[model samples]
Target: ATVLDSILEGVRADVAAREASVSLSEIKAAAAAAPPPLDVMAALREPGIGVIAEVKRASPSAGALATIADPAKLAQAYQDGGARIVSVVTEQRRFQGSLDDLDAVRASVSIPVLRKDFVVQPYQIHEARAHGADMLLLIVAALEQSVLVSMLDRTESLGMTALVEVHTEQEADRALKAGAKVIGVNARDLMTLDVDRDCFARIAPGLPSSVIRIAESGVRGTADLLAYAGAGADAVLVGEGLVTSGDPRAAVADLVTAGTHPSCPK
Candidate 1:
């Protein structure tokens, strides 16, 4: 079934807004400002769940998350809390995240930062690099097979790692066909907004054992993370859970433990 029309419209609006903010020059400048080079592949393979803590103001599903707009401070908090990577949402319409946020966050922490935005155009990948993103999120469901393949190729050429995301087995197969080694299985169906707890299970077996699988969306606690870990998720993108916690750092620490231990191995 096709995702609800409302969600698709929301996605389009979000993409349009981001395109307006990220002009060619802004992206170029951000790329020029990217931090000291590091190997994203090596970092993703390291012992933890590679918590890609995000700096998002809001989401259509969750609403106002962080009042703090300072990407630098947030990045430091994530780093100190044992995050190996960070995702700075640059989608202005829905997430209220900006390229400035990405730049500031990249400057503040030693960990790799991903420019979390909709990737429909090749220039957007270039924009991500300019914005200091060490990695980029490429959603499989958003693009047609041809567009997805081309985007993946461009993403690699730009020297940025891609976290190819999928919500179904068909998309997972497409991701594999596109040669994606790092796959993100997002539980929230973008089209319906319904969260399938078994989302990871649906796609895990289809993914190659060598692929670094990450689970995203609808994660509640350490237990939730542990469950996905048991299901072969290498890392998970836990934003809302950590952000709302009275002790954000401790919450992250708990997730880190659940995501990293050898018992969670894929």
Candidate 2:
């Protein structure tokens, strides 16, 4: 089985077990009390390329990254550096992240915090908002169109932005059909975890001008950001490159500065 399949298998078992303890009614109540989400699309659509800095510890392919003793501090640094949004990997096991990290980031930052997880069930939607997530990552290649359609509805109904992730033209179409307003073209393939730096460029033409375009993963610096921006990216979601740097704050600042600089004659 592919890496994604293995991860989802863990997600299902964990989600199913969690479902028994926390009913929909309980989590929805928590969601109702949580503060409202930020306008993520507006944040991403502001002029030059926006940066969505992520709080990632590690991945299956990359192994262990930064220690990240305090996720809140890291998130605050991201905000201070002009990040449009903060993405938190709440997936356990291979990713080595948790819901507590999401809560910490949300409590610390004014900008939106996206809960980046393998959400196969609607239960996780309520769970996301309950933990104070302003945005949710819905990977188009990972779920069915019907599931994707309804997942979009639930996320919005709870007043959270959904960063619908796509890896190919067909997946891009699936995301669009699912009524995705903010679509992130993921550079890293789910099945193989291999990154294609030009994945966004290849698929950007398929997206409507109205849809907010975000390039996810494989961005290590300003040069990469400039290239993606030139290829019609409105924003970029960065993980390893941002977290593994010497100073998270300064690193994010450089990226923000790079992203905001207007690339001439796109």
Candidate 3:
């Protein structure tokens, strides 16, 4: 199996273990009582390029990125730095993340929280909602078209926004056809784990202007964010850059300022 396939297998194992412990009915009940999902689309459509700051502990490509002892504190820093959304990596194993971290982040911040996980089943959606996720990641390449459509519908039914992630034109097409309102073009290819900084530029034009365009991965600093904004990205999902920046709040503020500057080519 390929690298992506291996990672997915591990996710399924973790999901099974969690499901065995927490029944779907219980999670659904918790979701029903959870607060309403935040208006993430509205936040993204604001005047300038929005920032979706992330709390990531590690990755397959970069290994351990940061020792995020307190995800909630980092999330609060992101929010204080003007990030419109806070993304918490909830996948364990490769990415040292957990649902508990997501819960902590959500409890600490008022901004919308994104559960960045490799979701292969509907139960994961209910789990995200139960844990107070305002948004979720749905990678187009990770699921079939039918499954993608079903997941999108389920996400909306629960009042959460789905950041449909794509690595190529075909994936973007599938996401668009599946009625994705927020589409993210990831520079990092899950299959090969390679990153091409121009991937977003190549794919952004193909997406309809109506959908919220997000550039994910390969964003190192303000210049990268500006380039994506110029390429028609409404927002950028940044993880490693912020997590390792020593001062996350300042780093995010700098990116936000650069992204929103009038001189930036839009």
Candidate 4:
């Protein structure tokens, strides 16, 4: 099986276990009680290229990226450094993330929070809202058109933005067909875990200007951010590069500065 398939298998099992403990109704109730979600698209539409800083501890390809003893602190730092949105990897097995991490980040940052995970079931959407996520990720390569449409509808019904993720031209088409208002073109291929830094430039033109365009992964510093911004990206989702840096806050600030510079191509 491919890396995406393996991760989904674990996500399904873990989601089932969580559902067994907390009924969907309970999760829905919690979501209802939670504060309303922030407007992530608006946040990204601000003057300069936005930065969606990620709270990532590890990944399947890199193994352990960072210790991340306090995810909330890191999220706060991202905010202080001028990140428009904070993405929290909530996958457990391969990514070494948890809902608790997302909850803590949500409490610590005033910016929009993205629940980054491999979501297959509708129950997970409710779970994300319950934990105060303003946005959720829906991978185009991972779901059928029918399922993607359904999930997008469900996400909108809950007042949360969906960052429909795509890795190829076909996936980008699928995401657009499913009414994705925000599209993220990931540089890394899910099946092989290999990153192509040029992937965004290759696929970004096909996306409509009406939708927010995000370049995910393979960004190391200011130069990378400037390149993506020049390629018409409204934001870049950065994880490993920032988290691994000695000073994550300063690292994010540098990228933000580069992205917002007048000379940036976009």
Model 2, CA-based lDDT: 0.82
Candidate 1: lDDT of 162? 92
Which lDDT value does model 2 have at 55?
A: 86
Residue range with the least summed lDDT across 10 consecutive positions in model 3? 59-68
TM-score of 4: 0.93
**Which ranges of candidate 4 are over 4 A from the true structure?**
59-68, 190-193
Evaluate model 3: give its TM-score: 0.93
**Candidate 1 CA-lDDT value:** 0.73
Q: How accurate is candidate 3 locally (lDDT)?
A: 0.85
Q: For model 2, how does the per-residue alpha-carbon lDDT over 1-266 read when each residue is reduced to its tens digit?
A: 77888889989888888878988888888888877777876787777778888886653333233424578987888888788899999888777898888988988998888999988888899999888888899998779899999999999998888989998999999999889998988878654556886678889989999898888877766777788878888888876644444466776788788776665214
Better of 1 and 3 by lDDT: 3
lDDT of 3 by residue, 152-176 (tens): 9999999999999998999998999
The TM-scores, one per candidate, come to 0.83, 0.92, 0.93, 0.93
> For every model in order, what is the number of clashing pairs?
2, 0, 0, 0
The models' CA-based lDDT, in order, is 0.73, 0.82, 0.85, 0.86
| Candidates ranked, most accurate by TM-score first | 4, 3, 2, 1
Error of 4 at 18 (Å): 0.5
